[PDB]
């Protein structure tokens, strides 16, 4: 488990339906919502990954052993039956070992490309910024639309912010 | 001013089991286990035979109820729940042996024995229990053998046949078991019964056993019937006295096919490579809960109803 | 002014298997294979019958052994080691696949054959073998006939047993092989012996033969037992010369129940779903390594001593 | 792997037996411990998770087909011992990958409860306070007992005390 | 002034499967499926037994292929494709229970039952089928009992092995089933022939039966094995009057082997545990694709080429 | 998985050839590279953990005839028990190979964080991160304060004043 999902994040975005991941602002302006794309994708593409390995078909032939319409001889009959019982007990577990631990692991997953997407604007507003421990960064100079969309860009220069952010933050 | 992260939620989410928690709410899953399949045998694709009331073991020997079914070539083969193997009483030894290998095959031959009999034997026997078409028959592929002249021994037999193919061949024959002392003599004579099966891989003794007083009991007339395989450039001879069923014809099964046991009806136009007692199944999904028995390439059978793959992110609504 | 973070840690660490780590050391663990189990069959909740020296196929039959065995009902049903199929020695057909098919019953039911013989009979042959009162006896569920007057042929019968019930009956009989010509022609004359049985889904032969062997419990002669089930309205009958061992009562098998083959004593205040022949298995883990022979619900045998499942944490001591 | 229990934390404490994870604090008044019961009981829970999965295993029903006390026909008789045989090396197999997965998982399950606690505390000190490489925060302003437990609490306003904070750190 | 991280990479990687990816490239992988294995048997370290063109069968009856294998002691014993068991023709009772007990076992002795028959009796019978020294001979370890006055009937017999040995023995015999009518009453005389075999735990009778048949080795007639085991301390009687094929010495399977059906040569230089119809499987894999059926201890067959197992890293080379 | 590997960093470093993780640096003086022991180690003890249990390894005799025929009922039985047996071991072979893969990459993402986080709680206030894997330093640091980074004998304390008024005009 990584720390966002479930987790420093208090809850999900009901209303973002463009994206699993996603940037929420706030400016002089009012309010702004978008969807952070390669992250989603990264995450859409781990879980198609993994559904096509579930849907993997190559397949054994198999005839039967047993009749339906006719009585077959008694010890030959309980060989068989106590096999297949065998070989689908063992299916039984594996089909829930399978979905358990897949299961486990796409949720965490998420939850790490979440942190990454997290991180990575942390790197970028560098100084300019502190965060406020809910998944917020505080942004210490004015940022209009078009600089929010800097940041989510990921083409936000923090040198050019820097002397403004460094003594707001200090004063 | 400031720039937040987060991530979608969804109103109603999907339960979901992991390593750690059972009932986990995730934003999405789906189902890794098959539960409905088709009702109907889907055979487009397949060169398949119906037999209908016709159950494998009458296409060797020619039950009436398999006239149509005598030979054939077909990828499926598929036997229905009350077919017909015999007109008149008896059974197969090793049936379920013999069975199986016609249900794996991909077709069958029929090759004629040749046997000739002499002139005290009646080879044109029938019986009333084996109807055809109205009128008193026998099974197709063999010949019930008796006395031309009632009461007086049935002379002293041999028969050959002889498998010049390239390819072994399945040979048939019955025994017939008379009701009483009194039919075994009028159509055998009075004599010791003996019949001879001996082949270079493959020998045998039978003796009829009469049974006695009424038809009503468990001891009446009855043709049981026996079997071997015959190798390619290798001959089987019949010594006989009077009670030997005798094959006019032999079989060659050819090839290989899948053999299904249902009741389902035939669908044309749909495909399947997985069938069951009661259907196909048309399955992308690895597992499958609808029957236990299965033949062809089938999803594994599982004793789940239900078991979810998560294809999303925990679900965290506000 | 500090604030440090840490987590615990234990002088005594526990060693578990990681993919990555064949000695890795955590705050704890616990197993996950069974080591241990119960040393009695725990039969709390559970109808059940504890043959002792009877053995199954004795019950069917009658052997002294199993005289308080001869009917009753069951969901669990015990098989001992000591256990006694045979007082007047012999073998049986198909013998394990009967025993299976008692062992796993729910009970047995007896119903008389109704078999009556006329004055050249004597039924009640009797035997110091199958001793049942400080006297000589022989099996409950059959009669030893031989000839009324000594050295006289045993004469021509026929008898037949309807079933007449709504499911099927298991009827049993033997054929008594003599150990001298001498003894043959005492009990049954010095005719040729024949007896031939047969139904609608059963006919067979059987000619007592004479021949000297090693005694077993005081008897150089042998009685081969055979069986077949008759299906409701069917009938089957005996045609016999002598050397017959007919049933007086035949079985009726009745639903279902597990067999077990044990060493353990019964303990009825003991619950358990799980059996071996040492006894049983309760827990709630998933493996276990008493034994691979296993009746019931169990956890799989697993060839291993020990697997410990981490509880915690990796373990570092200060 | 994640940085922390068996990585830049040198040690565990075996004086925490209040909880598995936890804080000690040395401050003016003395030195103090204390177990964080939010961050423990999230390990803990999972493990139990595992655990009722593991004993969560309801059963088929098999019968005898070897005869404990008679001879069983030969040929069919080792069918028998080579499909038992076969079906016992499949279990050995499961049964020591699950324990082998399970623990891997466990560990870093572990790990991670903990980092996410020391991450927690991070975000809450916010300028006040600077990393040590070991899991230690140097805290720049005088924090009092009830001020130490106002951290643990997840009540502390950095707020108040980031001026004081701020200088101390700079001078 | 600054510090950069990083980690390695190849110019060339390898593709691996994953969970999430069917073509992840990492910097190194290992094969966890055997490929190749051995055209030869591996026999160092095994005293073993080639049964050459001796059927297993054939041992315990003593036919002339086997007359080096009537004996021995073994760890592995070797079976060939076209094995001979029967000289005079015929077939066994349960034969594949006998043939995989043999093959189970590690070794066979040879006890004589010690049976002599009256002055009536000719027990040295001999066929052109069974041949040693290019001349008519017999199984070895059985005896082709006849009148040894042609037409006349054969004396009413007895015989009886006892087993005075503390382990179970395997006794065979045959019953001769004649071609022709003439036939059998020249050999066994006109009389009703009837065998029969008992001992405390094993009883069957047998009736000779005469019968047209192809010819096999030059003969229609037919010879029926049969065996059973014989308990400690238990005897076994044979009561006959023409048509036994007499048993002169009983067999006793010795411990424990391994069997092998292979047509590989042997090689004694190179040791294995695991085998298959061509030569051995040598590897410390798991997973094996050379064959689903194998002895002895084995990767587990899989119906696979190749499993990558990444032994590296994510490859991210330079653009 | 871990931010760094296929992630903030944008790609391996061929060059490196003595070890899986790394040190690059400039600085007055010129440029070097090192490879950094203890997270290589680590990884690859781990890697070679996954392959000691991979080789780890019951006697099996034949139940099936080579050169005889077998009896066509228990053939078939025996023919459906194999197979069963064999789809089950191809499907545990591919989970295996697939679920370790995956938990090899990571690991190995894994180590890579954890050198650098250590490496940033080393630096502490003197230097800050660029987001692709390297730390602007705001001191004068030479190849000895260099190997003092790698060894992680660094005292930040040294050069934290310098560096602070750096980080602040
Ligand atoms: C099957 O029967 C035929 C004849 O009944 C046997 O064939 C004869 O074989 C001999 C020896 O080669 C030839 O000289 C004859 O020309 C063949 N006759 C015919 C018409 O085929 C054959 O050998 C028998 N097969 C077996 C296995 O006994
Ligand atoms: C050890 O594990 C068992 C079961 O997981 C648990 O009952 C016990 O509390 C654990 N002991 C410790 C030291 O926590
Ligand atoms: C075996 O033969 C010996 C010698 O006649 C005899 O003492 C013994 O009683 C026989 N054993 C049995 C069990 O019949
Ligand atoms: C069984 O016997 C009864 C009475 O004779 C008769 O009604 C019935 O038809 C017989 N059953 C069969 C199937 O022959
Ligand atoms: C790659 O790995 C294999 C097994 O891990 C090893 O034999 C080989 O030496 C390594 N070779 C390289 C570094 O390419």
Redesign the interface.
């Given at each position: 488990?990584?720390?966002?999902?479930?987790?420093?994040?208090?809850?999900?975005?009901?209303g973002?339906?463009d994206?699993?991941?996603?940037?929420?602002?706030?400016?002089?302006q009012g309010t702004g919502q978008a969807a952070d794309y390669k992250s989603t994708q990264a995450?859409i593409?781990?879980?198609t990954?993994?559904?096509?390995?579930?849907?993997?078909?190559?397949?054994?032939?198999?005839?039967?052993?047993?009749?339906?319409?006719?009585e077959?001889?008694?010890?030959?009959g309980?060989?068989?039956?106590?096999?297949?019982?065998?070989?689908?007990?063992?299916?039984?577990?594996?089909?829930?070992?399978?979905?358990?631990?897949?299961?486990?692991?796409?949720?965490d997953?998420?939850?790490?490309?979440?942190?990454?997407?997290?991180?990575?604007?942390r790197?970028?507003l560098?100084?300019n910024?502190?965060?406020?421990?809910?998944?917020?960064?505080?942004?210490?100079?004015?940022?209009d639309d078009s600089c929010?969309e800097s940041?989510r860009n990921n083409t936000y220069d923090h040198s050019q912010y820097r002397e403004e952010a460094?003594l707001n933050?200090?004063n | 001013?400031?720039?937040?992260?987060?991530?979608?939620?969804?109103?109603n989410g999907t339960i979901?089991?992991?390593?750690?928690n059972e009932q986990?709410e995730?934003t999405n899953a789906?189902e890794?286990?098959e539960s409905t399949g088709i009702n109907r045998l889907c055979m487009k694709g397949r060169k398949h035979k119906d037999l209908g009331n016709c159950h494998p073991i009458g296409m060797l020997i020619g039950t009436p109820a398999c006239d149509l079914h005598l030979t054939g070539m077909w990828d499926t083969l598929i036997?229905?729940?009350?077919?017909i193997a015999y007109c008149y009483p008896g059974a197969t030894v090793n049936?379920?042996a013999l069975?199986?290998k016609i249900?794996?095959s991909g077709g069958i031959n029929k090759i004629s024995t040749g046997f000739t009999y002499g002139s005290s034997i009646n080879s044109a026997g029938t019986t009333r229990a084996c109807m055809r078409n109205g009128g008193n028959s026998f099974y197709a592929e063999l010949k019930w053998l008796v006395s031309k002249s009632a009461g007086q021994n049935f002379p002293q037999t041999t028969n050959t046949y002889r498998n010049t193919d390239t390819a072994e061949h399945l040979i048939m024959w019955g025994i017939h078991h008379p009701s009483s002392t009194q039919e075994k003599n009028t159509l055998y004579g009075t004599q010791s019964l003996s019949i001879s099966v001996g082949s270079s891989t493959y020998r045998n003794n039978f003796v009829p056993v009469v049974g006695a007083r009424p038809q009503v009991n468990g001891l009446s007339s009855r043709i049981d019937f026996h079997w071997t395989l015959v190798q390619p450039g290798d001959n089987i001879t019949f010594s006989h006295n009077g009670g030997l069923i005798a094959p006019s014809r032999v079989s060659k099964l050819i090839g290989r096919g899948?053999?299904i046991?249902?009741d389902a009806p035939i669908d044309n136009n749909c495909e399947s490579?997985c069938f069951w007692?009661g259907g196909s199944i048309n399955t992308?999904?690895?597992?499958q809960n609808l029957s236990?028995?299965?033949?062809?390439?089938?999803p594994?059978?599982?004793?789940?109803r239900s078991?979810?793959?998560?294809?999303?992110?925990?679900?965290?609504?506000?």
């Open positions: 488990l990584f720390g966002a999902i479930a987790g420093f994040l208090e809850n999900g975005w009901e973002m339906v994206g699993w991941y996603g940037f929420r602002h706030q400016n002089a995450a593409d781990q879980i990954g993994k559904l096509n390995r579930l849907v993997e078909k190559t397949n054994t032939e198999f005839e039967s052993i047993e009749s339906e319409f006719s077959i001889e008694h010890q030959i309980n060989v068989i039956n106590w096999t297949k019982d065998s070989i689908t007990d063992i299916w039984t577990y594996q089909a829930e070992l399978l979905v358990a631990m897949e299961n486990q692991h796409t949720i997953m998420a939850d790490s490309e979440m942190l990454n997407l997290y991180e990575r604007v790197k970028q560098r100084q910024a502190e965060e406020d421990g809910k998944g917020c960064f505080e942004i210490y100079h004015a940022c929010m940041i460094l933050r200090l | 001013d400031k720039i937040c992260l987060g991530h979608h939620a969804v109103a979901v089991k992991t390593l750690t986990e995730v789906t890794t286990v036997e229905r729940e009350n077919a049936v379920e069975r199986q249900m794996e899948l053999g046991q249902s490579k007692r992308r999904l690895p597992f236990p028995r299965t033949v062809g390439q089938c594994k059978y599982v004793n789940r078991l979810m793959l998560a294809t999303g992110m925990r679900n965290v609504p506000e």
